[PDB]
Fold Spike glycoprotein E1.
Amino acid sequence: YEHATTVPNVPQIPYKALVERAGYAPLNLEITVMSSEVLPSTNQEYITCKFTTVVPSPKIKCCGSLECQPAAHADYTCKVFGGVYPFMWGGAQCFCDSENSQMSEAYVELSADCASDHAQAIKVHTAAMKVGLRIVYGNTTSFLDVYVNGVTPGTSKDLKVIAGPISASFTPFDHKVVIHRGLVYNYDFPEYGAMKPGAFGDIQATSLTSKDLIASTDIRLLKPSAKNVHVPYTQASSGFEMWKNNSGRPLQETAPFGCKIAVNPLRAVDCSYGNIPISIDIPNAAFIRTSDAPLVSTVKCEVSECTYSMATLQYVSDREGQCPVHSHSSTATLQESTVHVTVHFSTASPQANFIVSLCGKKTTCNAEC
Amino acid sequence: YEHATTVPNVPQIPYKALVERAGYAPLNLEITVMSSEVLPSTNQEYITCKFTTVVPSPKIKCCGSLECQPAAHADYTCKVFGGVYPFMWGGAQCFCDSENSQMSEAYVELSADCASDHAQAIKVHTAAMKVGLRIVYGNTTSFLDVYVNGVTPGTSKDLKVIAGPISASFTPFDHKVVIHRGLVYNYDFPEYGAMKPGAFGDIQATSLTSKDLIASTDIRLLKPSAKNVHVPYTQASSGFEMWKNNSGRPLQETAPFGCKIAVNPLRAVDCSYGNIPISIDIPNAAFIRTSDAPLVSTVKCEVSECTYSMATLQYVSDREGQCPVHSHSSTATLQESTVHVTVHFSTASPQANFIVSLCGKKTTCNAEC
Amino acid sequence: YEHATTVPNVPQIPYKALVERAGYAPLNLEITVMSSEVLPSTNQEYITCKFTTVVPSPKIKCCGSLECQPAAHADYTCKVFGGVYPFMWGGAQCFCDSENSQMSEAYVELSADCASDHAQAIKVHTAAMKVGLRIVYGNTTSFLDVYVNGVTPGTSKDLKVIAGPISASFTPFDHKVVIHRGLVYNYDFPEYGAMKPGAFGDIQATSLTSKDLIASTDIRLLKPSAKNVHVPYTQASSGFEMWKNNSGRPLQETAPFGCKIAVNPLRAVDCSYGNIPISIDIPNAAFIRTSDAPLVSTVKCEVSECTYSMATLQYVSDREGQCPVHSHSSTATLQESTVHVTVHFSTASPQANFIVSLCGKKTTCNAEC
């Protein structure tokens, strides 16, 4: 094993803990962080891009009556205009004095160039964590992809390795995150079914290959002038051509604590946070080297080769095999662990004398520086 | 390296500098001066020597008129004399009473013996420098002819060796230097086109095989006496036969600081002056013997054989190879540098204990003386 | 012378000196400066302009070995690349797995457009002087091109006119002057054989029709990518296309004291400086009008016609001929000199009364114013 030691969140840093048991030889505990990956609960709901106005051909007639009927399309604003084309010299070659009408329909479908470049609207929430922690506990060297939580246990080398929930619940992604090419921004997209021509959500869709649209691009039908058969309207300039200016905060460049961001999975890599409380049920079989076998005598220690950031650990014992050696102070960490009589290690300390260890034992050592 | 150490101008003196870097082994820097050569900007302009008067034959006539015409030769002073040879009993067997004239021409061409012995007038100026500095930095022994200036870099052994401009701008040659046989004097020769019979520049020429002369040897035509056809003139005795007395200052014997002088290139050899600031961009590859390989222990030192101007440097290390050893005081310089366990050197000091170283380480040582 | 009077350096200004001899008539001395010309010792050494990279065709092979050999060209950086084109689908249709190499050569020759537009590097030094001084001393009016120095004498009108060295040794050209089209700048060009890609001296040459080059335009060979047979390099943009901005100081516009500058001879014209000490050995024959011939009586003087900047000099003598008349005060200079009984001159003074013267014487015158 029952153990539990605090282990922070900083890659490339070898961690060393110590087992202070009575009887059995104090084991070595080396753990290294390779690369962290934090992926929140991604829930795809909407997508957007450019569009193309699909204005049909008017069905101008004579003294006959007309009233448009709605159906199931994108955008719906139809108005019957009366009084246009008062004569044959007007444009439509009409014979009526003042009883003429038009349908004037106008919708907007997804453009052809939208299939490739797009934007995926999502609502980032309850972020999950998974850190592949290196494991070393003797002669074995296993690397496992472990989920960071106090619910999912391990196995590795007949051991129950638990990641444990970090005390830092800080996510670099807020409530809503939309994708762009291969970047990640913090966007304040409008509510579904409450769109506005204020940009940032024109004719939004469910996915890449959808078939149900909804929108309000401030479209208004205008009464044409008597000259030539035309269909003049005052449309709002697409906001997607203007969003390439007010983009701003890219997040990828404003990475907090050297953190990172992924494209496809929208994950945060190499991001330092808090501490990971690891607990492992190390059995009797792992505590190799009982008090009945190893019996090291007097410990000696002297320093020689040392430069800015072998300690002569000559011992005398019976039969080579294993032999755990670890530091006991607050400074100067060794490089290797299990090295059998004429032991050979190395350190990297300032000038104070140390001890560690190796193992057990222790020592310390030394230184140188 | 970026290094730079001061190195004086005295041949046959081994120079030893020290690299005080953090980490890598402090390298050895041996540099020796072989022979210095200082050649100024030589600009050949004029040459001189003996000459031979070329007096032609007079064209004496009778009662006819005469007036000489100038051309393009050396020296030009012609005067028509009237009243000479008043009768047939005078000399030229003339029939005129008092209407007789002569041309009387006289020029001076370069002698036949001038082709070999000569004198070359030059205007010594902006002196250049070139000193072949010996280079040693390990197992290599290269000798290069390097120009002494902070503009022309080097190569030698993958290193950028710079000579650097000396702080002493003293030249043994002044403004004008003329050659004689195989000697070098400081002469005050007259201005080109302003010659005078005051010697030191009679009928000067451009080079050895020229064809355009200019001069003024104070030549004057005199009216001959009526007796025999002659052409008597009062010429100035050549100054080149008199300059073998007022030569004086030979410079070669009054050599400043044991300096020398050359004949053909007019160069100053073995001439001590100031200091040569050398700077070399020594790369990582040259700094052999990192802190990870050599690990010499306790240093011991004792003196034995020493006479007026081996130090037992027994060491214990792993594997022979290189091993830089250098002095650290102000007196007692070693003879050799890189010598591998039972090291064997030698010194030449008075009686104090020196250093150381070796290397690195250281020491010191010782011484012885 | 034996005379000598100080004469300054300002063109279009008539100079008037006075001979104060005992006995003979005091002569008039008029001297005018036409146009000054100062040409320093021009020593052509280097020239520059645009260039064209001459990258040859690669000699890609198979599993055969390769090592490039240097010769005698401009620029020399060749590197054998290995590991490129691992397959037939790579680019060169190779059959080798990982044993393939290339030569990759690249030099730089003088461009075709360099023949006309160029730049001539020179080292301006010991400036010479030559001023064509007008000469008047009676009935003669000779104009001679005389060198300004106390070494080269004259002749003019049976007189030994000496220019004399000016007390002002100020040259508008400093140590180095390079030509551009038809302008003259003060440039700080690098040392010969110590060129750098810092511009102002890329691939310099001896002259216009040379055949020996030297340079270092920071050229570096890069390992190509496996796709299509190419030779990609990172070259430094020529400094000669950028020097049309940092040109600055043109000198021609910043002419000191209304001075000038020439194109072909690099001369300074109409440039005022100091004083020119002229000395002339005027013989007895030039001092016309002895005390035995002219005998002018009582001098009378009255002023009439005078405007802002004839003085009735009625005399009575025997026989017209010459007659030198000159001013004796510090203001009011005459226009003419030798004018015979009813003399007629003219002046240009303020309001003060003068004598113153014329011559011688015276016165014064016046015034016015």
Notes: The domain at 5-40+125-172+255-280 of chain B is CATH 2.60.98.10 (Tick-borne Encephalitis virus Glycoprotein; domain 1). The two ends of chain B are 40 Å apart (CA to CA). Residues 78 and 105 of chain B are 5 Å apart (CA to CA).
